[PDB]
Design a protein around this nucleic acid. Structure first.
Lengths: 313, 320, 320, 317
DNA sequence: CCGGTTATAACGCCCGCCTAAGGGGCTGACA
DNA sequence: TGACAGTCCCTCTTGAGGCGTTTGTTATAACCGG
DNA sequence: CGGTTATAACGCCCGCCTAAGGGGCTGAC
DNA sequence: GACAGTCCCTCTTGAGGCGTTTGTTATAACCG
């Protein structure tokens, strides 16, 4: 029943799996049992699995990566939940759709992209390229996260609960300060509200620093024009800018300039890494800016002039 | 006003000489554990109940993986030591808790600005946090004997085994230090004779090493409390160092009045000590030595904002 | 003559397209395994016998942990694939076979001195080992199509999946290369018509990708053998590259006559390529690219003798 | 057959490729453990009998804390790897008291004077122990091809724990080295023409892979002995390398024939190498690499008054 | 044109198998 | 008569080395009824 | 003095404690 | 009424270390 899926969700939350990971796994576990007439996975195994996966490939045109997530979700279910791991030989129809090469803009392309973009989104997207931030990393920024004493930005808890310090483009200082000032206004106004629970804080932080939620420094850098009503603990707070809006903002502006390469937020991040490299920065330097734990990962972001030693003999 | 059980645990621990902060910590998760199962006795519960509690903290409780981990540390003790019936849970952890906070340092100006507001008799220990990078409790647990005027340094004793470290000491603080060692003897003299006074607190290994040590000024705290207190692990009166919470509150409000916008705590002063030493050209191994880092990687974090920021990596946006 | 069993295994493998050197290797440890149990059938033996053999190698046999490990790799195959009855041994290893050899490079003078003695028709491939740092078999398996005169480089295809790498090419070798591609077509023409010739060997994935490829000069080896040979995985005649053992013997004796005292092998030439690039100031990531290293740590070994030796670390004896 | 059980333990370990010295160490403690009790089988024993032997080592044994530790591990090995029945982690026993004396470290002038009253017969070897921080056996096992004159360096093959490394060399020794090599060349040229000369000894099964290697000069030891030996395995004679023990006392005597009241031995020359490099400003990781430590944290235990010279940041405010 | 479930891309970094070497010899048909 | 090449051989090693990755976790990009 | 013991030294992840940073109450001056 | 407090807490950790006789592998020190 729907009580088994809830127990799986609880298991994962205790083991502190990422939220997105839980949704991903659940979704594939869900439409797995859904595939079969909702028959309990405990009464199934390798056989039923190597069918769902093949069902995803064929008559599903699922992407090779998509199939992979599913494979892992299922494997998780059978190893961690029902302590009875699948076999490593499960043969199934592997997808065919080959992932298109990572799109990477060019100086002038980006230069023109940052043009036809309304000021309402100029700063955010400039941070995505100027400091190679991820979409949500940029959207979750907080006033205290911007360091003017050193040209840098503190990215707290990025993908996989890792903190990092990234570079900032000095030229944005005036823009940033203005943006902060803009956020200060909403703060000064929202402070005097019948039901303002201040800014949302990471896991049980409001309990440790009950005052933090009402301190400006903890407030989002890019807040929304209105206010929201937080379901948990019926209170209102000023949530941050909408991701989706920024996502299409960059998509449209990308069209309103030419560039027929299908450019999105993460492609601006790729450009950041690519451009730093083309200027001579060291790979490990780029690695640290992106937050990769190992250079070998960054090397998959680098896809002559050497005179043969024989010639110097 | 608390349960007879909690009181028995607190005493069990005080006998094994567990740290004060450990007792407070473990107890807190134990009572929270108990009051979650409606005062049911913990000896009647086991893994099942512990996991239900941990899950509780994790999901609606929204606690952090590390705090849930401490909770499990408490309950594990409660069952391994007290109640000789160890747990058998599987810490199928996921997220790694080696991830330190991103240091936030104050500009030399913000520090000057801070010290201007920190009222007297509060700034000697505060100037030591920044001047010697001491950690809050290393400062509070300093002993007269620890200040070295000959070589201008302070000796910090961390952990047992006689492990120590010698940090730098600002000489423009000697007269202030002398006034303190004096104020210290001013209490030591009026206390040496009270037949309550059991002498200054001292680590078991030391107290037995130099049985007379607890009564010699040399071993007395540099920043003594305004009054005598009762040592919970021996039930005798002795003079404890000033309450650390005092400085924590002090620093926080002083910065608030000083008009500093970024959060300022004792740690902050220590971070600033490290960063400023680096900015002047000190070698990381040196700064590593000054702090107590046994691994340079730890010390290296203070390096990032420097050469991992604008001054070290030029933003691609700064070009085209 | 050898056993009918060994012959069956050799064929089992040749069908799964296992590498030639793999077959020779696995077979060698299998026959040695068999002849150790007095030629008893391996299907009648199991873990017990395998472990007794491994122990034999280890102990009086005095073999190296890695070679004993390959032996276990062979037997594991012999039981997992052929004889569907997998082993169940515990590789309770102990040495850590990640420990690469300490590279030994030749001075630019010793290399000049070497090339002087290496007779003609032997030095084009040898000059490629040093001139482009190629690995012996990457050199022997080069194809006409792989030499790029426009950009002065060579394309090396390692592993399947279409994985490759582009190395530098000494331009003072163009005319020599042209003579070779010619000599290659001189064989390609006289062979294209023999109704034996099945074309040049080609990776399964490729051969099926471009079914005509085996017959176009483009895909033919740059250093063809003096005569046609029979492909064991398809039983057809084709022209293979020159036998690598030829160069191995060549280099070895040429250095001997050249009066070079240190051991010289093909690897040696590759090591020298790397070191010399570094000495001239090339960046390790670059040299890493030139070789096929996926991890700089590998490339870094060539750095040690440089800045980890006298020129980088001054011996304390050199002072007092 | 008790001596057979010990032989099976030795075989177990050799297959799992434990170091030779490790096998001897473990065996020796396993041996005098069962020896402790009337030679009774360890399979019929456990925590109880163990926490007695160890206590027996401490008390009425005055065994060094480290010595006790090795024993504890040897025993634990026996009960975990051999008789798959691991001891408990609570085994309480009398811990030793003898505190290891601080690592002795000479000084520039001390070493300077030490290298003086040493006969030329041992001047080069000991100079390598300090000049390149080599370990005793590392220096004694050197081979002609191991010295790199093109770059000031020495290739130390398979040092402690099967690890290879490249260490620095003192250029000034080039002439001495070449002379020493020339000296070894003479013995080689003479020994080559011998009725039963199996050439130089090679590492594990190397002579089978390179049957000619044993007769190549480059593979011959740098510091050979004046005579020849008769290798038990494969009845043949070869020129083994200089005697360790002789060098060990050589450095001990010369240490006395100077002054130096600190009890100086070979590894103390190595400590000096690390210490001196550090005192000159070399980076710790640099020293780490020269010694062969896999982690700096180990080398940091080689960096233990004066003036820190660190001006307090408060003073610069 | 929009929010919400999807679908995919991206980060994650060890080691189990397989594949290169380096040697000494050994046959042939060949200048 | 010999130096050389062999899809050579070998019951010869590995002081030999490297490719490969859809059984892991966690983001952003994209699809598609009101 | 050499064959045996004794014992330095390399090894380097993470379990279990301990230290913080915060509001707030309160009892001796 | 400020204010320090072996304060209090059924606060938490955007918190951080110490510690290390239950591993291996060398060299140094014993004694007949």
């Amino acid at each position: 029943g729907s009580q088994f899926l809830l127990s799986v969700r609880e298991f994962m939350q205790t083991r502190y799996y990422a939220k997105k990971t839980i949704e991903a796994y659940l979704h594939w576990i869900t439409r797995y049992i859904h595939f079969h007439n909702k028959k309990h996975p405990s009464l199934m195994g390798d056989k039923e699995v190597e069918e769902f996966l093949t069902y995803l490939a064929v008559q599903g045109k699922v992407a090779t990566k998509t199939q992979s997530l599913a494979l892992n979700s299922l494997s998780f279910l059978y190893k961690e939940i029902l302590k009875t791991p699948l076999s490593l030989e499960i043969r199934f129809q592997r997808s065919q759709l080959e992932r298109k090469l990572p799109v990477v803009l060019t100086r002038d392309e980006i230069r023109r992209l940052l043009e036809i973009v309304d000021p309402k989104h100029q700063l955010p997207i400039k941070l995505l390229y100027g400091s190679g931030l991820r979409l949500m990393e940029c959207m979750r920024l907080r006033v205290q996260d911007i360091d003017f004493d050193y040209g840098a930005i503190r990215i707290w808890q990025g993908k996989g609960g890792k903190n990092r310090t990234v570079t900032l483009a000095k030229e944005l200082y005036p823009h940033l300060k203005e943006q902060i000032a803009l956020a200060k206004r909403y703060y000064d106004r929202d402070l005097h509200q019948k039901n303002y629970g201040g800014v949302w804080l990471p896991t049980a932080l409001k309990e440790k620093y009950p005052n933090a939620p009402y301190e400006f420094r903890w407030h989002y850098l890019f807040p929304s024009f209105q206010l929201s009503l937080d379901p948990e603990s019926d209170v209102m707070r000023r949530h941050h800018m909408n991701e989706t809006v920024l996502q299409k903002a960059v998509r449209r502006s990308a069209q309103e300039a030419g560039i027929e390469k299908t450019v999105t937020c993460h492609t601006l991040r790729h450009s950041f890494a690519t451009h730093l490299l083309e200027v001579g920065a060291d790979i490990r330097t780029v690695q640290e800016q992106l937050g990769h734990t190992d250079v070998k990962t960054t090397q998959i972001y680098t896809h002559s002039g050497v005179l043969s030693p024989l010639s110097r003999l």
